[PDB]
């Protein structure tokens, strides 16, 4: 009869230790709390986004404060290739003298951490030059995080809480999020690049006391309104300009050479100021599509139910019944959440796939570890955000879908044939594993039995055609931007490919990651990646589509999202729920991104070490993946502390072994199940009651923690031990053997 | 078109034929790999060209996919044979080999036997006769 949890009274009268843990993992599910209406629902979503934005702005103010105070941003900015950044300082009061000395690195007078985040390269590019502009940017983000904690407190006061009609204003939110949140704030970033970041990359110092007087262009403020727009791209930075100096600079602010800066191997700052200006014009235009109260625009409710196409009688958009989908998306907060995680786990993969090939930051191509730790970061974020895009698909079907309102539309038609999508995701999965594993352990046996020439090596000639259709002249397909006598190369009616001669210098230089050389070792991993993306879609689609029920239990909606089972009847129904299929696909998300980021790392660890013929001859069989990548590159990692000493990788040699322990302890929660431990806690609770001098007594009775909890407790350790081990191998096998 | 030179004039494949053993595995199967395209490390790749490897890639398709649908059609026509005899529960464990061979030689001409059931509409079962779930 306790007070905690106050949100659900069926859990506050729990007499066991399940009350503490189930009040943690239910505290943010606002839709299941006792005594909550729909208007009070949205006003706590809204005021906890404010308390979440303040965490982001206080986290970003701890990056800035700790490199202004403890970092070497003044020292690093003078030789950004031959000195390492500093994250923060070490105060671990149990170091020995061998770890004070080993961690006093990068020219510090104290133990420090080498920053592998790449925020030094970000602030060098956008025009931050001193430790004071970092400090007053950290004090501003503290105050910016205070106006978001105050706004969240404001919008729970009863005179300022919005009503349900304001939260369900979907057309007015799309107008301001495209024009104002995405359009103006990309127009404003082109304002920072033109005013501050481009002139500070050319030597002159533009600050708050300086930007209102010196215009960013000699033809300033006038060539925009007349129509002389070509003035802004007249003389650009030439190919002997060195960064943050005046020697070789130009005066163009919006030019479109394309390709890379020849000194930083990064995109031109004039190319990105032009870029966010073209994004802003296109997005502010797109924000004037839907109707607010000014009578013009589109009504999304009309676009669903429109059944007339210039006199014809189509069933809707693309002759498909989309009626009733406006009130399906708008009322479901899980349909809107799953579409927002699917669109954020694509933008997080697209971050990773582009920032290594087209680096935007100064000298981040020549920092091999921050380039490697930022690919693997954004691909594991994008794998988590895509498992959660299908986790809330399953919560949408259970909690937020009704077949009567969605009658005959495009959402009933998927459930009408859902055993044909799962039967075909399970064929592509079965195809791509019988011929990707079978083609490795054919190549494994052939190299093992002497005859390496008997390997089946499929040259990936369809993605070698993509590079040859973009400018890579290495293969010799000689078509379509590899053929300079073509229609796409010249663009015969206008000849306005001003981006093209700078792009082809970038794709045909063999020193960048832009469209790397693709061989038969890359054919094979893309079918492991395709096997990975198809099975973890199969587990998540079967979790979403069988969330209503199947023949093993036709009332899965009545039991909720996360229930253990339905007993040992009907054969046994372990892991039957839609939670437990959004759960087996975290083992496949982590596995697939242990194939993506194992292949990103080994393809790049062969280019950075020069041994390109190491990956190209021994990635076609699974021994070279094990001998030449895992066993070979962990030599310098596990020697972070030998019996004879200790170096700067002594914390990555420890986290690598902390992550094997966290992985192995996960298996206790995954192999052993609950009733082994309930008969053992029943025995240790006997020996506590019958012993003298033990004056404690449990307020709430010790039970073995529940079935769907230890799946989560054993997936948390599997994930943390997957990330502490690979985020200490990728850091220490790159920051030692560069 | 690509850099996949044939293994005749590839300067890294002739060393695999220079120092090699003899027995049966590195002499006659190595001079038969000479007409194969191989990269800059002397390993015979499998590329897809228009006409020079049109039927050179279509023999592993047509030879396999015939005896992929020869195992599948003799297994389908056996399960349909024992269900018209109304004894399919016990004929699947104890394989009636006079019938399974009779349903094997009926599957030797299966590409001209599948399309006799596609146009007759008897290959697929119709959607209102197949067990499904609550959907």
């Amino acid at each position: 009869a306790t007070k905690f949890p106050k949100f659900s009274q069926d859990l506050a009268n729990d007499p066991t230790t399940r009350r503490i843990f189930y009040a943690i993992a239910t505290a943010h599910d606002f839709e299941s709390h006792d005594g909550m209406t729909e208007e009070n629902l949205y006003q706590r979503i809204f005021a906890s986004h404010f308390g979440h934005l303040a965490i982001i702005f206080l986290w970003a103010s701890g990056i800035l404060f700790h490199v202004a105070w403890q970092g070497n941003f003044e020292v690093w900015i003078k030789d950004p290739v031959h000195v390492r950044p500093i994250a923060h300082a070490i105060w671990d009061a149990q170091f020995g003298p061998g770890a004070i000395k080993a961690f006093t690195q990068a020219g510090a007078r104290n133990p420090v951490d080498i920053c592998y985040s790449g925020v030094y390269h970000w602030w060098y590019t956008i025009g931050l030059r001193t430790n004071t502009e970092l400090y007053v940017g950290a004090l501003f983000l503290i105050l910016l995080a205070a106006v978001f904690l105050f706004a969240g407190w404001l919008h729970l006061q009863p005179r300022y809480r919005p009503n349900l009609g304001w939260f369900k204003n979907s057309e007015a939110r799309l107008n301001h999020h495209l024009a104002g949140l995405f359009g103006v704030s990309s127009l404003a970033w082109a304002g920072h690049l033109v005013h501050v970041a481009i002139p500070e990359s050319r030597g002159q110092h533009v600050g708050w006391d300086n930007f209102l007087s010196t215009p960013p262009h000699p033809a300033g403020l006038w060539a925009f309104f007349t129509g002389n727009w070509g003035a802004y791209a007249q003389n650009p930075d030439t190919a002997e300009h060195v960064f943050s100096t005046s020697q070789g600079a130009g005066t163009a602010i919006l030019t479109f050479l394309g390709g890379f800066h020849p000194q930083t191997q990064s995109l031109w700052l004039t190319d990105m100021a032009h870029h966010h200006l073209a994004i802003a014009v296109v997005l502010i235009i797109a924000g004037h599509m839907y109707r607010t109260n000014w009578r013009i625009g589109h009504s999304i409710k009309e676009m669903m139910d429109s059944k007339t196409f210039f006199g014809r009688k189509v069933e809707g958009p693309f002759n498909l019944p989309h009626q009733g989908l406006y009130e399906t998306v708008n009322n479901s907060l899980h349909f809107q959440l799953s579409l927002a995680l699917a669109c954020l786990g694509v933008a997080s993969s697209l971050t990773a796939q582009h920032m290594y090939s087209m680096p935007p930051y100064a000298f981040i191509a020549k920092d091999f570890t921050t380039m490697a730790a930022l690919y693997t970061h954004h691909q594991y974020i994008a794998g988590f955000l895509m498992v959660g895009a299908f986790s809330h698909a399953a919560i949408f079907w259970i909690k937020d879908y009704d077949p009567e309102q969605n009658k005959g539309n495009v959402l009933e038609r998927v459930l009408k044939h859902k055993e044909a999508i799962i039967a075909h995701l399970s064929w592509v999965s079965l195809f791509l594993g019988f011929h990707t594993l079978g083609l490795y352990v054919h190549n494994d046996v052939e190299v093992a039995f002497g005859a390496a020439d008997k390997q089946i090596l499929i040259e990936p000639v369809f993605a070698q055609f993509i590079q040859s259709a973009n400018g890579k002249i290495l293969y010799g397909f000689h078509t379509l931007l590899s053929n300079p006598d073509s229609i796409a190369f010249t663009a015969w009616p206008n000849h306005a490919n001003v981006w093209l001669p700078g792009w082809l210098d970038a794709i045909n230089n063999g020193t960048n990651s832009l469209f790397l050389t693709i061989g038969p070792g890359d054919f094979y991993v893309h079918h492991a990646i395709a096997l990975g993306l198809h099975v973890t879609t199969l587990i998540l689609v079967k979790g979403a589509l069988d969330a209503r029920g199947s023949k093993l239990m036709p009332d899965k909606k009545d039991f909720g999202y996360a229930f253990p089972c339905d007993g040992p009847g009907r054969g046994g129904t372990c892991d039957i729920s839609a939670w437990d299929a959004s759960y087996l696909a975290v083992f496949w998300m982590l596995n697939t991104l242990g194939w993506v980021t194992f292949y990103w790392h080994w393809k790049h660890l062969s280019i950075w070490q020069g041994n390109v013929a190491q990956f190209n001859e021994s990635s076609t069989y699974l021994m070279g993946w094990f001998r030449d990548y895992l066993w070979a590159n962990s030599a310098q990692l596990i020697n972070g502390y030998n019996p004879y000493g200790t170096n700067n990788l002594a914390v990555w040699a420890w986290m690598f072994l902390f992550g094997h322990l966290a992985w192995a302890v996960s298996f206790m929660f995954l192999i052993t199940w609950r009733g082994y431990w309930q008969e053992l806690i029943e025995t240790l609770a006997w020996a506590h009651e019958q012993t003298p001098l033990s004056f404690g007594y449990w307020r709430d009775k010790p039970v073995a923690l529940s079935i769907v909890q230890a799946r989560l407790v054993g997936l948390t350790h599997f994930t943390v031990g997957y990330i502490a081990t690979y985020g200490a191998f990728l850091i220490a096998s790159t920051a030692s053997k560069f | 078109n690509t850099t996949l030179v044939p293994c005749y004039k590839s300067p890294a494949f002739v060393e695999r034929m220079k120092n090699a053993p003899d027995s049966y595995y590195t002499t006659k199967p190595l001079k038969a790999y000479s007409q194969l395209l191989c990269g800059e490390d002397g390993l015979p790749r499998i590329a897809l060209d228009r006409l020079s490897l049109a039927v050179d890639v279509a023999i592993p398709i047509a030879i396999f996919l015939y005896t992929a649908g020869f195992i599948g059609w003799s297994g389908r026509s056996y399960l349909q044979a024992i269900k018209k005899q109304d004894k399919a529960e016990e004929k699947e464990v104890f394989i009636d080999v006079p019938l399974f061979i009779s349903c094997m030689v009926m599957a030797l001409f299966w590409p001209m036997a599948v399309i006799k059931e596609l146009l007759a509409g008897e290959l697929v079962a119709k959607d209102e006769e197949i067990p499904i779930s609550v959907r």
Partner: peptide
């Protein structure tokens, strides 16, 4: 029925597959 809208979108995507495969075998330029 004769499928008129499922075809001419499947063989429209198959048409775009055949223009890309025309450049791939260097048929057209």
């Amino acid at each position: 029925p004769p499928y008129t809208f499922r075809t001419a979108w499947a063989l429209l995507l198959l048409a775009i597959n055949f223009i890309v495969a025309a450049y791939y075998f260097h048929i057209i330029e």
